[PDB]
Design an enzyme around this catalytic site. Structure first.
Site, PDB file in Angstrom:
ATOM      1  N   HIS A   2       7.033 -11.062  -0.553  1.00 61.12           N
ATOM      2  CA  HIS A   2       6.951  -9.632  -0.981  1.00 61.12           C
ATOM      3  C   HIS A   2       7.922  -8.721  -0.205  1.00 61.12           C
ATOM      4  O   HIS A   2       8.057  -7.536  -0.607  1.00 61.12           O
ATOM      5  CB  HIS A   2       5.530  -9.109  -0.948  1.00 61.12           C
ATOM      6  CG  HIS A   2       4.934  -8.949   0.402  1.00 61.12           C
ATOM      7  ND1 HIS A   2       4.018  -9.858   0.889  1.00 61.12           N
ATOM      8  CD2 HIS A   2       5.011  -7.944   1.301  1.00 61.12           C
ATOM      9  CE1 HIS A   2       3.623  -9.463   2.082  1.00 61.12           C
ATOM     10  NE2 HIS A   2       4.213  -8.285   2.350  1.00 61.12           N
TER      11      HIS A   2
ATOM     12  N   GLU B 137       4.084 -17.668  -0.840  1.00 62.93           N
ATOM     13  CA  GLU B 137       4.344 -16.344  -0.193  1.00 62.93           C
ATOM     14  C   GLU B 137       5.268 -16.503   1.022  1.00 62.93           C
ATOM     15  O   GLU B 137       5.411 -15.518   1.765  1.00 62.93           O
ATOM     16  CB  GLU B 137       3.004 -15.686   0.167  1.00 62.93           C
ATOM     17  CG  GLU B 137       3.072 -14.159   0.398  1.00 62.93           C
ATOM     18  CD  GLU B 137       3.746 -13.346  -0.698  1.00 62.93           C
ATOM     19  OE1 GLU B 137       3.723 -13.793  -1.858  1.00 62.93           O
ATOM     20  OE2 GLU B 137       4.345 -12.292  -0.377  1.00 62.93           O
TER      21      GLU B 137
ATOM     22  N   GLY C  46       2.003  -2.853   8.336  1.00 59.92           N
ATOM     23  CA  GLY C  46       2.888  -2.979   9.508  1.00 59.92           C
ATOM     24  C   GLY C  46       2.873  -4.384  10.118  1.00 59.92           C
ATOM     25  O   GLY C  46       3.810  -4.687  10.878  1.00 59.92           O
TER      26      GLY C  46
ATOM     27  N   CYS D 217       2.658  -7.461   8.385  1.00 59.09           N
ATOM     28  CA  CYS D 217       3.221  -8.545   7.529  1.00 59.09           C
ATOM     29  C   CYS D 217       4.426  -9.178   8.209  1.00 59.09           C
ATOM     30  O   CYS D 217       5.306  -8.442   8.725  1.00 59.09           O
ATOM     31  CB  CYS D 217       3.507  -8.081   6.106  1.00 59.09           C
ATOM     32  SG  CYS D 217       1.934  -7.781   5.254  1.00 59.09           S
TER      33      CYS D 217
END
Ligand SMILES: Cc1nsc(N2CCO[C@H](C)[C@H]2C)n1
Length: 182
Positions: A41, A72, A146, A148
């Site tokens: 992402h 991911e 904040g 990730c």
């Protein structure tokens, strides 16, 4: 404060950079040579900022399992003039549960942040922001925006990168040794 935080600090000091994309600032884990990981992402493009230096992306691959499900994890190769310390021998070979993990973050917003998240469950399937996702680790800490890309470690193992949360729990994508063979 203890041997958990010691291992976490050794990884943060030598194997992390601040990555900036159009979707913001992320902790980014360098694994070996010019190869790093980041949550998918982050939407890595042709150009990325690495510790505020404009950097060409030589390759980027959004990983999926052989069921063709999102993991991911994006593996990035950076046109950087310097190699990372090779930490591939700290990566687990199999999917597993863990005791006593630390989540460590380094950004403009959250410099030198370390969180003892405790017990880590092999959660497996998660619907992550609407996307079916496999190989998810779960920990019972209220992680926030904040964090990730944050590195999840136990003493002697780098087990995952933080990819999301639901206000009560946090979720990490597994790192496996098999992702970084060459
Ligand atoms: C669980 C938790 N304890 S303090 C905290 N935050 C997020 C990181 O640093 C902020 C200044 C602070 C408000 N989050």
């Amino acid at each position: 404060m203890g041997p958990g935080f010691d291992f976490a600090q050794a990884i943060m000091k030598k194997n992390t950079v601040i990555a900036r994309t159009e979707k913001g600032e992320f902790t980014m884990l360098g694994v070996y040579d010019r190869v790093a990981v980041i949550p998918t992402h982050a939407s890595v493009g042709e150009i990325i900022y690495i510790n505020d230096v404009e950097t060409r992306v030589l390759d980027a691959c959004a990983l999926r399992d052989l069921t063709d499900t999102n993991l991911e994890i994006t593996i990035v190769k950076l046109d950087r003039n310097q190699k990372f310390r090779d930490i591939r021998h700290f990566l687990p070979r199999c999917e597993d549960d863990y005791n006593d993990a630390v989540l460590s973050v380094h950004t403009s917003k959250f410099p030198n942040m370390y969180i003892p998240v405790g017990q880590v469950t092999n959660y497996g399937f998660l619907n992550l922001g609407g996307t079916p996702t496999h190989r998810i680790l779960m920990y019972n800490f209220p992680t926030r925006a904040g964090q990730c890309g944050g590195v999840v470690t136990t003493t002697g193992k780098v087990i995952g990168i933080h990819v999301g949360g639901n206000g009560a729990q946090g979720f990490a994508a597994m790192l496996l040794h098999s992702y970084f063979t060459d």
